[PDB]
Design a protein around this ligand. Structure first.
Ligand SMILES: O=c1ccn([C@@H]2O[C@H](COP(=O)(O)OP(=O)(O)O[C@H]3O[C@H](CO)[C@@H](O)[C@H](O)[C@H]3O)[C@@H](O)[C@H]2O)c(=O)[nH]1
Ligand SMILES: [Ca+2]
Length: 539
């Protein structure tokens, strides 16, 4: 998998009596100087490969009928193989920072109890729980707007509870039409304030607004902020509102968009995570991930043949939490189904184990190439609940670029749509019709998936988020990397190519109680029934 020589490339692409064309010369020259760059940085070696790839399709575009074309197409696959070789031979241990993010409200003790498992076993890592000291009321504002929209939708459904078919479908449709209004009433208010005084703090705009419109208690809100601040402070809280240079001015604008306007804490955390990884380097994790388990802790408890690999992984953590009680409250539902005998095999293993570092596996030295961002996989697909990146790695810039290029398209089309439109449905139509008119084979899927942006968090099955700041931007980045592009939106990467970027398996346990709980954010008819219930179950 060593890249072909200029010499050998001449053999591949040889056509008897054919003139050495200027564009073919360029290729050969470039490839020769690549083999002359051993002392160069890996990024500089990658950029030399990239250049060569651009020279090759410029030949293939200039001479569409050339006899060289078949080998030149092969050659381009070797360039891509070559990226992998660079990446595998440039491994170096990540900055030992461990990142979590909790924004928009008070951290739960659940979050704290998981994080602690990581902190307790990674003493050589700096744990940093990123929070936004200006934005503790985001979940409150949201819960309030959503609460108000709900109770207004039910008032309108009041006598029609039993028939014909005012079901969950129509509830969310109509509630959404109301949420949009209330959300746009706040955004317009927040915007006006920010044009008035730009030193104005988010939470201060939100309390002023809750107090007037939703009759929310100023005192209580200030109290709430004080508790949030104090709690994260005590728990390695790192305020993003101190940190200077990390700030891409466009990413900052996207973060705020997702935080203050869209109230989507997941999206802003998507944006925040990669930005901090680019600025700080390290391992990023969602607060619902726990450390991996020592390989040997359980290595002689043979899995009963009937139970799945997934359950078993889930069982092992529950065994850990039954017998060590590290996280109080942690479930044993699955564990307690096993034969008493196996349960005791688990108990035994956990008896001769003194400290937590003999139970979980410490990150220690994780290596990564400047060319990559490692990512977790769930169910054969990438998932960005766990990431690894050197500071200022080439792949974190590909990711950030992807986020910027996607949002530009979203914003360029959605802002004009919001402006013109009496209501939600009117705006959505304007927006879809806008998205349709610039859509093509390449970006069609993307357009489809971000069409429902305005419903994210407010209705089920929306996927906009995935395609702007989540898993899609990473496969977009990985394809950019391997295919020497800067615009991948139509992804032809397969699982085993993408496995080249997998977060090391033994060093994370994804199958925690909280995670599995968060995989049920399928459909809830049960909510429109519980909101129904909140109207005969009361005063
Ligand atoms: O009030 C909140 C809620 C979420 N988060 C952040 O979002 C992360 C993911 O939250 P989670 O409850 O796990 O939501 P999911 O929908 O299960 O998250 C999935 O989808 C998101 C895509 O936006 C990604 O951020 C996650 O990595 C991915 O696991 C958390 O760790 C937090 O950093 C907050 O900061 N505040
Ligand atoms: Ca989750």
């Amino acid at each position: 998998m060593n890249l072909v020589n200029k010499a050998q490339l001449q053999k591949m692409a040889y056509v008897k009596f054919r003139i050495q064309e200027d564009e073919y010369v360029a290729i050969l020259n470039a490839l020769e100087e690549y083999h002359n760059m051993s002392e160069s940085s890996v990024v500089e070696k990658y950029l030399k490969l990239k250049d060569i790839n651009n020279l090759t399709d410029n030949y293939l575009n200039t001479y569409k009928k050339s006899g060289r074309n078949k080998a030149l197409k092969k050659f381009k696959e070797y360039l891509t193989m070559e990226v992998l070789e660079l990446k595998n031979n440039s491994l170096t241990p990540v900055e030992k920072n461990l990142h979590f993010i909790w924004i928009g409200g008070q951290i739960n003790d659940t979050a704290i109890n998981y994080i602690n498992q990581w902190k307790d076993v990674n003493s050589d890592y700096t744990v940093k729980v990123f929070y936004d000291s200006n934005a503790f009321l985001i979940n409150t504002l949201k819960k309030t707007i959503v609460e108000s929209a709900t109770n207004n939708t039910l008032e309108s459904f009041r006598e029609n509870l039993n028939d014909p078919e005012f079901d969950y479908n129509k509830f969310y449709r109509k509630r959404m039409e109301i949420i949009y209004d209330k959300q746009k009433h706040f955004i317009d208010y927040y915007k006006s304030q920010i044009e008035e005084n730009p030193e104005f703090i988010i939470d201060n705009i939100i309390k002023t607004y809750l107090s007037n419109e939703y009759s929310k208690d100023l005192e209580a809100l200030n109290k709430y902020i004080e508790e949030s601040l104090n709690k994260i402070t005590a728990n390695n809280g790192n305020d993003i509102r101190n940190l200077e240079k990390f700030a891409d001015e466009d990413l900052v604008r996207l973060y705020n968009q997702e935080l203050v306007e869209r109230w989507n804490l997941a999206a802003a955390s998507d944006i925040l995570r990669i930005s901090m990884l680019k600025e700080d380097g390290g391992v990023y994790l969602d607060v619902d991930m726990l450390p991996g388990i020592q390989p040997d802790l359980f290595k002689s408890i043979n899995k009963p043949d009937s139970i799945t690999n997934t359950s078993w992984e889930m069982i092992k953590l529950e065994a850990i939490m039954k017998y060590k009680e590290y996280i109080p409250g942690y479930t044993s539902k699955n564990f307690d189904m096993l034969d008493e005998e196996v349960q005791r095999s688990f108990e035994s293993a956990l008896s001769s184990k003194s400290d937590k570092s003999e139970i979980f596996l410490p990150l220690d030295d994780i290596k990564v190439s400047p060319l990559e961002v490692k990512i977790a996989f769930a169910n054969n697909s990438v998932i960005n609940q766990a990431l690894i990146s050197l500071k200022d790695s080439y792949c974190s810039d590909l990711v950030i670029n992807q986020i910027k290029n996607r949002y530009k398209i979203l914003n360029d089309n959605l802002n004009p749509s919001i402006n013109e439109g009496t209501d939600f449905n009117t705006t959505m139509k304007i927006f879809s019709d806008k998205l349709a008119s610039i859509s093509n084979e390449d970006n069609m899927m993307f357009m489809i998936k971000i069409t429902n942006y305005l419903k994210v968090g407010f209705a089920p099955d929306v996927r906009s988020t995935i395609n702007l700041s989540g898993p899609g931007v990473y496969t977009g980045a990985y394809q950019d990397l391997l295919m020497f592009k800067d615009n991948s939106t139509n992804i032809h990467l397969l699982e085993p190519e993408l496995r080249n970027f997998e977060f090391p398996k033994t060093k994370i346990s994804q199958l925690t109680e909280q995670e599995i709980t968060s995989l049920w954010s399928a459909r809830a008819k049960s909510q429109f029934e519980e909101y129904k219930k909140g109207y005969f179950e009361g005063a």
